């Protein structure tokens, strides 16, 4: 288990979202969407959720997992819509 | 269709924008609308006659008395503010000087001077209360009546201090007779008969113009100079610092009365023959005033002087009016 700050796209506030060190970026975005999609942000089917480190903008591969991303506990991540 | 006015219609069109005083004290009396039948009843009722004769027929005349204005522009709201403060000062003195034992420090002589010259004043003072309250109900204008109102309250006030201080003194010197012996002193003591006659007689001068002169121009100045001024300074020099301060506190009220009494006279002089009317009345009562000052002050130590100062001080009150 590992905490991160979710800054979902089109949403208005960054939120606390607990993820797992084993989760792939895809799964991290899954956990973040739960707190934004259908709450403050409309779903976008023909789109894909990617995870980038908020501070520098590094874009993580969909398949990469939390352990391998070198994240600081509580690190803020952008969850943006891509193709 | 009559459109709304900027102020009362009787004040409409002067245009220094009326004051609260004017808004609430002017042109209020209505019995003066029909001098033939002042009250809404049979024109021959005794009250109709009394007014037809004592207000309307007064030789002291003016085309429009409602023009009168109290120089202090007193109103019920501001009278209580003014006096509530002054009472705070005075109740203060009473409370604290007492805590200090002030009354115990007075000599036996002075205590007796108080039973003789101070305390019986509850009568003379109440008499003035009665006197100023008669002026109130026979004057020809609500603004004159109002000055008379507050002045009557002031009198009841002086009467109240005296009543208060009489009981305080009685508790401190239970054998003197304080509170119990004043009526006899007021009624039989030579030093008092001067004032008692002046007031008992003045109290039946029903003409408003004469009541005003008899009471506010002659009697009061003399009572004020004899009982407040003279007795006060004496008290001060006799170690009675309370009566000295108290008397001074009341002199403030006396001065406000003189202030409006003057304004009235100033106004009355705007017309021929009134000064003569006012002087014949004063000429009539002045004699009874000197008799009061002589009977009272001569009995005080340093008599002849008190008599000379009170005599010219009270005269000075009228001289400065003309």
């Amino acid at each position: 288990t590992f905490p991160i700050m979710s800054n979902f796209e089109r949403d208005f506030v960054i939120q606390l979202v607990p993820v797992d060190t084993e989760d792939t970026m895809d799964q991290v975005a899954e956990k973040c969407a739960y707190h934004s999609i259908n709450r403050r942000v409309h779903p976008q089917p023909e789109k894909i959720l990617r995870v980038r480190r908020h501070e520098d903008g590094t874009l993580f591969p969909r398949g990469m997992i939390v352990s391998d991303a070198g994240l600081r506990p509580t690190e803020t991540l952008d969850i943006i819509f891509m193709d | 269709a009559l459109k709304p006015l900027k102020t009362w219609s009787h004040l409409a069109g002067n245009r220094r924008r009326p004051s609260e005083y004017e808004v609430v004290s002017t042109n209020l009396h209505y019995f003066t609308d029909n001098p033939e039948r002042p009250w809404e009843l049979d024109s021959n009722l005794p009250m109709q006659t009394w007014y037809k004769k004592y207000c309307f027929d007064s030789p002291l005349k003016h085309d429009d008395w409602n023009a009168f204005r109290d120089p202090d522009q007193l109103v019920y709201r501001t009278y209580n503010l003014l006096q509530d403060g002054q009472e705070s000062y005075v109740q203060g003195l009473f409370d604290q000087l007492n805590d200090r034992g002030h009354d115990q420090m007075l000599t036996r002589e002075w205590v007796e001077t108080l039973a003789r010259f101070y305390t019986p004043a509850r009568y003379l003072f109440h008499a003035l209360q009665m006197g100023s309250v008669y002026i109130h109900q026979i004057a020809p204008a609500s603004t004159i009546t109002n000055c008379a109102t507050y002045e009557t309250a002031d009198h009841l006030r002086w009467l109240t201090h005296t009543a208060y201080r009489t009981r305080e003194l009685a508790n401190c010197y239970p054998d003197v007779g304080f509170g119990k012996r004043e009526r006899d002193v007021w009624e039989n003591d030579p030093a008092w008969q001067g004032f008692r006659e002046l007031i008992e007689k003045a109290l039946i001068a029903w003409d408003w113009g004469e009541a005003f002169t008899a009471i506010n121009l002659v009697t009061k100045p003399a009572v004020e100079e004899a009982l407040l001024q003279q007795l006060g300074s004496l008290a001060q020099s006799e170690g009675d610092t309370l009566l000295g301060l108290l008397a001074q506190a009341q002199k403030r009220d006396a001065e406000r009365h003189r202030r409006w009494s003057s304004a009235l006279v100033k106004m009355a002089l705007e017309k021929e023959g009134n000064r003569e009317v006012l002087q014949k009345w004063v000429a009539k009562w002045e004699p009874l005033a000197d008799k009061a000052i002589e009977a009272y002050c001569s009995a005080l130590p340093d008599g002849e002087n008190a008599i000379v100062e009170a005599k010219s001080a009270s005269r000075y009150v009228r001289q400065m009016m003309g």
């Binding site: - | 269709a1 808004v23 609430v24 109102t149």
Partner: protein, 491 residues
């Protein structure tokens, strides 16, 4: 330290003395004192139940005004008057015009006792009484003054008593008879016992409540504030009746109370009656003028009189009876003669109100309800002119109010005429005429409005001339308060 009021109070009213440079009668003229053969010693038994001293006064009253004036300032800009029910605005405009100067006049009535009463307690209480009415005269001028820019009608808060508008005359008729032309002892009975302790006291309580209920806090504060002062000086009459009964004159006392109560009731049935049952919104009435009178006014008079050792007036049963009729007539009269008053009379006869009226007064629709029916059709059918008058009503010579009573199925309108010294008088009731007869010299040559019209004293001698004679002009002449809104329900 300070003394206990208990300790020195008496000395403040130990002020009587035996005059000698003038006689007692000279100092206390009977026509002004009314000592009635009772002695100073006897009158010195006078002991006011509610005691107060100068310091306590200037202090307490200072606080009373701070509150009232503070409230008024705070709600001033809110301009509530502009969105208040028209029946309420009317109620106020009526209140100030008929009361402000008479309040001020009471100051003199109190002065009468302050100088001429032989009971020293009465003289001081009257001095505070004097001060109280001064407040009432001023504050009740100051307050309406805030609306002079809104309608000339507010100018009548000062102007009214200075005119010959029929209502003002009825007012002066009452006040001059009760407090301005009576001896000291008399004033304390007829004014403070009969009128103030008897009517205005309880009334003001309700008026303050009514105001509250109308969302008019400035006025609610004003009234209930004024009201708290009533107590301190309304007492004065009681101790006077006591001394009179305990000495020879129980009859003299009774007689004054009798007159004072009737004359009060009459003024009350045109100034208060019509307002409760018709100007106040139906949804804001917790009781009928009759219920009010029965609970808050009548019961208390009986306890009062019983305790003083007096009897109920000879007209008492008629009085209770008349609680069902009189004010309805005074209201219909005033509304019908709409343009002759300075405020807008609230018809108050819509379907719902008419139900209420029928409930509070069984038989109302069959009697009073009928005149109104006719008034309504004419309004429905576009004949407004038939709802205003073309002649004057018959004014009673005692209360100077129209002579009216039950119409409809139980028509019972009477006139207690009286020929006296070659002149025929008209009275609105048995009691009104009796007030004249027990003391004719007091009212003999007075002339009511009809009298003046019929004497040529009103010129031109027509309605236009009468209006001018009463200082009424378009702008202040009254019309239907809700502007006939209540009509469109009948269509």
């Amino acid at each position: 330290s300070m003394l206990k009021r208990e300790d020195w109070y008496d000395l403040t009213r130990t002020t009587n003395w035996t005059p000698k440079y003038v006689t007692e009668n000279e100092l206390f003229p009977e026509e002004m004192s009314g000592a009635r053969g009772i002695s100073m010693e006897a009158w010195e038994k006078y002991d006011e139940p509610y005691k107060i001293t100068y310091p306590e006064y200037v202090s307490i009253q200072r606080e009373k005004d701070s509150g009232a004036y503070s409230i008024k300032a705070a709600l001033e800009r809110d301009g509530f008057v502009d969105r208040a029910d028209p029946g309420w605005v009317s109620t106020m405009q009526l209140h100030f015009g008929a009361i402000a100067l008479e309040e001020y006049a009471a100051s003199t009535a109190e002065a009468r006792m302050a100088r001429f009463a032989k009971a020293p307690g009465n003289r001081n209480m009257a001095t505070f009484g004097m001060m109280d009415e001064n407040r009432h005269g001023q504050i009740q001028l100051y307050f309406p003054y805030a609306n002079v820019k809104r309608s000339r009608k507010w100018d009548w808060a000062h102007k009214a008593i200075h005119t010959n508008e029929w209502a003002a005359i009825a007012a002066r008729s009452f006040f001059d008879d009760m407090m301005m032309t009576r001896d000291s002892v008399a004033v304390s009975i007829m004014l403070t016992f009969a009128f103030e302790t008897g009517f205005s006291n309880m009334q003001f309580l309700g008026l303050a409540a009514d105001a509250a209920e109308a969302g008019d806090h400035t006025f609610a504060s004003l009234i209930s504030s004024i009201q708290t002062d009533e107590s301190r000086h309304a007492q004065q009459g009681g101790p006077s009746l006591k001394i009179l009964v305990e000495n020879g004159k129980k009859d003299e006392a009774q007689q004054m109370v009798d007159v004072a109560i009737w004359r009060s009731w009459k003024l009350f049935s045109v100034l208060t009656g019509p307002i409760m049952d018709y100007y106040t919104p139906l949804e804001s009435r917790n009781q009928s003028f009759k219920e009010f009178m029965l609970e808050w006014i009548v019961a208390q008079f009986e306890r009062q009189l019983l305790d003083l050792g007096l009897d109920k007036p000879w007209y008492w049963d008629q009085f209770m009876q008349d609680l069902d009729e009189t004010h309805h007539g005074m209201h219909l009269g005033v509304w019908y003669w709409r343009p002759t008053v300075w405020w807008d009379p609230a018809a108050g006869v819509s379907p719902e109100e008419r139900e209420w009226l029928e409930e509070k007064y069984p038989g109302w629709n069959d009697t009073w309800g009928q005149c109104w029916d006719v008034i309504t059709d004419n309004l429905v059918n576009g004949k407004p002119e038939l709802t205003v008058p073309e002649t004057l009503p018959t004014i009673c010579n005692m209360c100077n109010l129209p002579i009216a009573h039950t119409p409809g199925n139980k028509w019972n309108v009477k006139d207690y005429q009286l020929e006296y010294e070659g002149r025929l008088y008209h009275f609105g009731s048995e009691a009104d005429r009796w007030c004249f007869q027990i003391d004719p010299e007091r009212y003999e040559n007075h002339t009511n409005l009809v009298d003046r019209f019929l004497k040529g004293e009103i010129q031109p001698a027509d309605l236009a001339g009468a209006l001018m004679y009463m200082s009424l002009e378009p702008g202040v002449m009254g019309d239907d308060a809700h502007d006939y809104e209540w009509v469109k329900a009948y269509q």
